[PDB]
Design an enzyme around this catalytic site. Structure first.
Site, PDB file in Angstrom:
ATOM      1  CE  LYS B 151       9.120  -8.937 -14.715  1.00 18.46           C
ATOM      2  NZ  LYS B 151       8.687 -10.318 -15.186  1.00 18.46           N
ATOM      3  CD  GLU B 206       7.896   0.662  -8.807  1.00 14.93           C
ATOM      4  OE1 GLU B 206       6.904   0.858  -9.545  1.00 14.93           O
ATOM      5  OE2 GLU B 206       7.807   0.003  -7.761  1.00 14.93           O
ATOM      6  CD  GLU B 309       2.093  -2.015  -9.367  1.00 12.10           C
ATOM      7  OE1 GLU B 309       2.615  -0.947  -9.698  1.00 12.10           O
ATOM      8  OE2 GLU B 309       2.527  -3.137  -9.723  1.00 12.10           O
TER       9      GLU B 309
END
Ligand code: MG
Ligand code: MG
Ligand code: MG
Ligand code: MG
Ligand code: MG
Ligand code: MG
Ligand code: MG
Ligand code: MG
Lengths: 357, 357, 357, 357
Positions: B151, B206, B309
């Site tokens: 992240k 992403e 995921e």
């Protein structure tokens, strides 16, 4: 829980009779380790080519392969050999036949399920003697035939216009009339021809110019209300993405063997459905095994909504190796019922209706 | 030859425990006229919405429907109701579960066959205490985990760069490292950020900006070597055609329920394969029934090659209604074996591991 | 096995008579080391320009050059001198004449072989007295002339429309009717003019506006069914690539000397064939040597399918230096038979039919 | 003045030895009405396919055909049969062999004349043992070899980079170094790979991704200074026009048989020259007859300036049917001298160096 592997194949080069004569056909029989038999047929669009492909190149890929993993085997065959779409499609056909018979499912069932039970069958209007054709139509429309395809660009344009006028005068919209120029027009001078036949509102006009001329095809589609259908401009998923990008056609004919089989044809149609381009089943080979495969595909592929036609109706397949023929009636093919492809082939039916080379 | 119709359904609103707590889940049980049971789950991406959808809108479509005609029923549900993709996907799931159990086939088998037996499972790196995360990686890489997703855009950029430097310094290319900005960047000022993290060669980045900014996304993809993956920019086949046309992403995450089910996800991936865009399984809901469906899909869909995921690893599903859990080990989900979805649910397992509203 | 080099040249500036008068022509005689003679002619589209080009700039390139290496010599002449396409084409012509005579081959033979034996010859309709022209047509159509080109944009538009109406009323499609505006229209206000004459379905409309206005030309082509032919918009291969890219024309006129010779004209036509643009032979100079070259080219270049016309029919070449004239009959040029260019020139024929400066 | 027709053919299926083994080859012998013999060879890129094509489909077109009208016959063969480019090219080859022998001209001479006498021959660097390859280079560069092609995307990227570093460290620009990924890269993740090898300034990088991915190929070309060469993206003139339009490559490999013969290859190169794309001779089949044809083509086609290579150097053709082999020395093929193809084949040479099926 069913799992099984391919145990052996037999490849047959057969001669089959027609009447307009002979044609040669490559048939593949696959047999699983648990005894279940499935058939495929390689229909060209030279049978020696396909015949060698199966016998030497593809044989070591088929043998041992798990029959539940059809897409996996097709990816192996595409990696090891390049562009024998016909031979590969016969292998897929046969494995799906076996898988279907082993599980009590048809090939349509294994492709997402049937969405239709009959397929409109186009009747070709191509007789030099138009009056002969008019009487055929006169009998066939009351019998439930609606789909007709006129070969155009063969007689002088004026004569073809008078023919279309006579057809619309009697039948109006009671017939679903399609025109096919068989790639005979050139981009130079096509537009006046196409504009003239566009006034009769055919359901579509098929591939008026050769494969190369995508800008010309896009030009036609842009100027004309009548849908332009791509045939030779669209063999596979790659062509289709370019057709969409250029807006070069309003509909496509799906060639099970040109595109590389049944699963590849459904992938092709996912693109086409998203893009708003209906599919047409194109020219189906009358050989019973390949025809069964095509009929199952179309049965399970809702975007192929424009019907289908036979390879060349003017020469009909006189005897086949099926115990029972795929049936058509009142303007539609009947999608054969039963597991796998829904056809049967015995030793007698095979060795007594085709001459084996 | 198996043919049968849906005879009844039960829709359950259940509460399930987590630890980071509660979550509510819509489970559907469908039962055929020949006694075979199948399960589906509607996982949002408000459960009352889905719950009413099934109970009132979709119920008269399910009841009587032929279980072999899944695609036909999905077209009926899309025609009568608009955009409850989750509830419709639970119906499809359950019918494929039944069809599979009736025929001895898994759902993967009915979707063209397995092409893989395990699915790489991404491990989320999102701990404010990076040292805590580094030790986790230190244990997990030797245990066979390779896929990690960091992240990003959460700590000051400089700190995130030092973190990436430490990760590449120890592990080099032994880890398949992905970054996720969770749409937090704006098109203004994103490029310097993205260019900095592009030097560490992540496998993909992403959705750095929100769904709208397709030109910005195309701008990023054009300037950067690192693949840009579309998530919220690509929900369905329509979005994907626009993403391809604009070259707005190099890869897409496939949301089984955002795109409208298992067959729709495979149609989506036919477009993406032709266009050269790999798929990622996205965020799978840990609820065992929906997870089984997602695992079967990915097992049968070769273009979804980037792994998957779990919805939010930081809160794990503590008890489930499955007799046995879908398993993961050494960085991959094990695709459950067995017919249908490959899971079982008894009255006891259901009414003793979830609180029924 | 034939190999030989150029040994000497003679360049002749000649005066030739016409009737509507005089014109000057540059003729080149090349002679090989093994005695074989070949002729070329530089036809403008100032003869002093060409004359000096050969005598000073190109002479040291010709002399010694191997006659079997024509393309190699043309690349040398293009590298050392820029844009004297006429003079260079006379050298190529002559070397191919020699090579042909040495090997028993015509120039067509050396350019891939004949694909036709006659070339449709356009008859110009340009008489202010239209009735005079109508009677000419009345005699010529029964004699086998089909190709007519009407000069348009010269008389008031209404009068030109009544003329076209009279022509289509008598002849219908028995004539292949072309219109030529000689670049006289402006992009402002051309479309109403062009749309009016488009209703008579001419085979093509030639270059209605000047060379610059490619967008205007593309505009016309896009709006009109009638093919638009580029003349001054397309001199060479470079122009043609831009014409294709902009879709600014449906057909091109090939100018052997504007494009830079016989091999360059065939390269130009490879592009045009791929792009679906037919070629027209344009305005051929009546000088026998240049005309022989043009006729051989067209004979060997299948894409030049629209026929040809003479430089200005209203002034005919009265005496020429050929022992025998290139022949036309019944609406077509007869492609001369025999090796090389298929023409002969003696000292007497030359010095007795043209006045040598 | 020479004119003559084809009087008979013999088609031979032969086996020829290699060492890395056997390969099968289709050879065609054509004989004119005035006794002159010419040879062609169909080299695939299944020999039974080609073999039947000539024997049944093309035989009635060849027989009687005028040997001076090669382009006319090729247009007949393309109209009657679709896409057997190899077999058609063998017919063209043989007719040009005959025409050449009848007139004292080589095939190059009949294609516009030689523009070069030698063709740079690429040496493949593909040994798993790089040190073995380095010593080969160490001997070959002083011997005059300059052109090397490294197979890439086979060893780990880091190792391939160290190899390129060692090669540039010793040889610098004394070698003309090309890289070939053999379509092994995917558009996802190719750019970091390609950017790394672009720093070594290879002369070109060949087809890093499969044929479909033209946008990806255009993406690479746009981002990289290093020329990208299209191989499988460009088979024919149609592909080339799309490659130019999309700017998807900087150079193309010309496949005599993929594009459909010698004249078609020169048409292809007219487009490419205008567009500024150099050609590479690609992979030439070592069979002496097909190799002679390819060498003559390249000799006469100036835009094919990047040299050539042999089909697969790692397996060399041990005995051939030529009285004398086409020769290479010091890094270049020697363009054989003499009329026609410049090779000879006797009954003994044929029936004593290949096993006839
Ligand atoms: Mg339209
Ligand atoms: Mg067709
Ligand atoms: Mg990028
Ligand atoms: Mg996301
Ligand atoms: Mg137009
Ligand atoms: Mg003009
Ligand atoms: Mg570049
Ligand atoms: Mg290659």
């Amino acid at each position: 829980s069913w799992d099984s592997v391919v145990e052996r194949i037999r490849i047959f080069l057969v001669e089959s009779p027609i009447k307009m004569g002979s044609v040669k056909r490559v048939l593949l029989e696959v047999t699983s380790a648990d005894g279940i038999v499935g058939w495929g047929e390689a229909a060209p669009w030279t049978p020696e080519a396909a015949f060698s492909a199966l016998d030497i190149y593809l044989r070591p890929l088929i043998l041992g392969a798990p029959i539940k993993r059809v897409r996996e085997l097709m990816a192996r065959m595409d990696k090891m050999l390049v562009g024998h779409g016909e031979a590969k499609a016969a292998v897929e056909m046969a494995l799906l036949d076996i898988l279907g018979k082993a599980t009590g499912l048809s090939v349509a069932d294994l492709l997402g399920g049937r969405v239709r039970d009959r397929i409109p069958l186009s009747f070709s209007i191509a007789d030099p003697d138009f009056d002969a054709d008019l009487e055929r139509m006169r009998a066939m429309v009351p019998a439930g035939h609606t789909v007709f395809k006129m070969k155009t660009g063969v007689k002088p344009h004026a004569e073809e216009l008078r023919i279309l006028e006579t057809m619309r005068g009697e039948f109006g919209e009671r017939i679903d009339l399609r025109l096919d120029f068989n790639q005979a027009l050139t981009p130079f001078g096509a537009m006046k021809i196409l504009r003239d036949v566009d006034a009769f509102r055919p359901t579509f006009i098929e591939q008026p110019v050769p494969r190369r001329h995508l800008d010309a095809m896009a030009g036609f589609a842009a100027a004309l209300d009548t849908p332009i259908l791509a045939d030779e401009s669209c063999f596979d998923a790659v062509d289709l993405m370019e057709v969409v990008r250029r807006q070069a056609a309003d509909a496509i004919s799906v060639k099970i063997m040109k595109c590389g089989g049944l699963m590849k044809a459904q992938s092709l149609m996912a693109i086409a459905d998203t893009a708003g381009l209906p599919g047409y089943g194109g020219t189906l080979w009358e050989g019973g095994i390949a025809l069964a495969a095509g009929t199952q595909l179309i049965a399970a592929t809702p975007g192929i909504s424009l019907g289908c036609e036979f390879y060349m109706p003017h020469h009909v397949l006189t005897e086949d190796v099926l115990e029972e023929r795929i049936a058509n009636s009142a303007g539609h093919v009947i999608v054969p019922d039963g597991p796998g492809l829904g056809i049967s082939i015995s030793e007698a039916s095979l060795r007594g209706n085709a001459k084996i080379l």
